[PDB]
Design a binder for this molecule. Sequence first.
Ligand SMILES: COCC(CCO[C@H]1CC[C@@]2(C)C(=CC[C@H]3[C@@H]4C[C@@H]5O[C@]6(CC[C@@H](C)CO6)[C@@H](C)[C@@H]5[C@@]4(C)CC[C@@H]32)C1)COC
Ligand SMILES: COCC(CCO[C@H]1CC[C@@]2(C)C(=CC[C@H]3[C@@H]4C[C@@H]5O[C@]6(CC[C@@H](C)CO6)[C@@H](C)[C@@H]5[C@@]4(C)CC[C@@H]32)C1)COC
Lengths: 88, 651, 111
Amino acid sequence: DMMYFVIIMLVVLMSFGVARQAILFPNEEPSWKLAKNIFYMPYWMIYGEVFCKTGAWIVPAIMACYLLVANILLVNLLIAVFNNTFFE
Amino acid sequence: LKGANASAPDQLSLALAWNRVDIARSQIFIYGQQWPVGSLEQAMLDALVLDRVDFVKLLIENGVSMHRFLTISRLEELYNTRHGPSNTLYHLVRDVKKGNLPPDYRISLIDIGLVIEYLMGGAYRCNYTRKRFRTLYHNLNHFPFPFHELMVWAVLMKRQKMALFFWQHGEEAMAKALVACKLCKAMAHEASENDMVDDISQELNHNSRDFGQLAVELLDQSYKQDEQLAMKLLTYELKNWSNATCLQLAVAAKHRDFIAHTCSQMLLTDMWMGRLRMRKNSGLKVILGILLPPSILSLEFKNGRKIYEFYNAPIVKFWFYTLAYIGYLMLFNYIVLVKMERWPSTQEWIVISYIFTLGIEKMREILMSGKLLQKVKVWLQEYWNVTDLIAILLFSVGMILRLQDQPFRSDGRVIYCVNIIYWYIRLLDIFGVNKYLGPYVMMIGKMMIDMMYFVIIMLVVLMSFGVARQAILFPNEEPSWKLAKNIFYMPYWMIYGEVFADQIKTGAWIVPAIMACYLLVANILLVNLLIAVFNNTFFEVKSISNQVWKFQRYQLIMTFHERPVLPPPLIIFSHMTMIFQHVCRDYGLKLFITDDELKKVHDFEEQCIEEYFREKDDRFNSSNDERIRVTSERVENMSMRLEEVNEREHS
Amino acid sequence: VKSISNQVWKFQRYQLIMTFHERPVLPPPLIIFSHMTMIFQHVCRDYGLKLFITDDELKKVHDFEEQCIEEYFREKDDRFNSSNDERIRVTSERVENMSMRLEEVNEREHS
Ligand SMILES: COCC(CCO[C@H]1CC[C@@]2(C)C(=CC[C@H]3[C@@H]4C[C@@H]5O[C@]6(CC[C@@H](C)CO6)[C@@H](C)[C@@H]5[C@@]4(C)CC[C@@H]32)C1)COC
Ligand SMILES: COCC(CCO[C@H]1CC[C@@]2(C)C(=CC[C@H]3[C@@H]4C[C@@H]5O[C@]6(CC[C@@H](C)CO6)[C@@H](C)[C@@H]5[C@@]4(C)CC[C@@H]32)C1)COC
């Protein structure tokens, strides 16, 4: 069950990370550094480490939605699943 | 009876009017009654219209045969009767005929056929409205299956006991059960619409539930007795019920418990695998065969042509679509992560072509689904289609905006970055095919509501605290939109662990106190209450999600059976094949059988229903309540008899 | 706790309805007008609380209630007399009485 919820969390996290990195940095030459910025910060920012370009104001809004979905909707569901599949 | 000294039909009519069946069973039907010719059928006709189940059964048991009794004229007289309980057949006839009928209008079988075709659905075509029957009815017999018409008559006129009696006699029991369930449900909806007395709208649902339960029990008995014949019974074309399988009738009736049964799941899996025999390990070998055409011939096919037979299996089409979608997603990520040129790159053109092909395929699908406005309403009934339309339109406006001046180019790139989130999220629909990822996605969808109902209160408290703190700390702010940002921002980041005691004047010391109260309320009470709510509303939600997923397997299988072989990115070739052919379901939907197999299946179903009824009666007569009641009655009777015996004194 | 909360909310619906039925039409920000027009009328529930009825309808309602209570008592008695415990007890008593009577019958010997 941990693995399944990890799969879903990875999908959502990659979506948010790619969207934010694409919005903020528009002039990046193709390099392997791009493949690291889409996973690193969105993964560290769900464990309590929370912190002009055109349309830069959408980043805090999508960040709020991402935190409210990943840190609330899925974690509590995982808790419920662990709770109700325990006796057997 | 013996005082009248009249003929047997007169005594029988008296007993029929009194609704006393045992008197007729004992006194009337005796050794050599010498019934006049035509008397028994007249008594059967009289007993039908008065709703006497016991007398109809008794007359059937003593020589009356429905195959000779029932004609077109007698059925017509049955449909126009008045000496019975209330029914809503006349209102349905009026609605179908749009109220043009004169008062005391004489109903005809064509009107009943129109009512049935209106009630069943869209593709239904009743046997009454076909050309052959209309020709035979204009120039004026026999009914090959009388019990079908008798059961339909009993269901439409709302006589439940007669319907249950006619259900167990004759062939095609499951088809009759499913059709009756659908008709009762549709009539309940129609009566609830036109402001009826509202007892009808809660008795017709009871009738529908009874018929659905009977169909499920009969399917369970058939599957227990034999699996291959049960699966063959669920697929053969029903000639008498507008050319549909039992599965399609179950799906149109929205009967979730019938599809969720194990037999239906095995049949749908065997449809999903197509012509391939592989059952122990699929998926990885399917994509192996997709990538390696030499690996295709090393597989096993059920009884040159192997490649064409392989590409038409639904599972191979599904995996091809999944691989194409994953490739498109990778190209989308690549074109949004790197710098954008003045003119689009090759991968951007691939993405645009894929989106255009998907859009035109969706519009072709909505254009092949009669009246234009009705297909739109049916196709917009799903949230996925609406989201696809919104995403495609937004992507089109981005494409229009992207090929313009530099600020418009930046705005188009931003709209692409925003739009990629939906195409990343939509992988959950692909995951719904998996046996475990479907129910969890449905469960998340159901828990969204409980999440929102606490998001509301969290917003209320958060806005209160933010306004209080911002008003205390900053007293000389000119009215600007910056004020509307400090209300929500910091108090929202402070509940996710980003609490800054350093970043928090007259009365400035109240800010830490209200901050402590706000943290203790928001991050302790509401969160744990939400956890408790999610915990205690989980079992029913997961069972419902499992049932709904098992029901939607059929729709997914049919959707990928209708799908063309090529994936959307290169669907252009087959999108112009039907254009030239316009001016120019052997299995996976039905299963055509011959006459001998049809007769064998009918006898099998009859044996199953007889066995099921016998088992039910045997189970009922051996339960504790029945034994206790019968023992009490016999003990009381014996006590009275023994009191009578001891009362006498010959001494 | 949730069952108790549901019950209490369903109970308090009535008080909320009566509270908003009594209140004046105007909202508090502009209630000053109805707060001074009521002063002048001092020296000058057709439905929503009750329902005044006629006499014939009153007779009909009384007969309906009497039929309902009679039916309810008859149904309760019929349900009670068919339960398993009652049948077991009555059967045991009748079997014991019958056994005593049959012992008396077989006790006599006219042979
Ligand atoms: C510094 O100079 C180096 C240069 C070499 C340039 O290499 C580039 C080649 C393309 C490559 C590997 C680069 C950056 C982002 C890479 C993408 C990250 C995305 O993330 C994924 C992963 C998860 C998916 C679900 C979504 O997308 C990939 C498919 C996507 C990806 C792997 C597609 C290919 C991209 C680097 C040499 O010059 C000759
Ligand atoms: C820099 O110069 C700009 C100036 C324009 C001045 O615009 C001001 C107009 C009033 C406005 C929009 C401003 C600041 C706070 C705004 C409030 C935030 C509050 O938050 C809410 C939201 C949630 C509610 C439940 C509580 O209050 C709003 C109702 C409340 C609000 C929208 C009421 C109106 C206020 C900006 C131009 O000079 C001509």
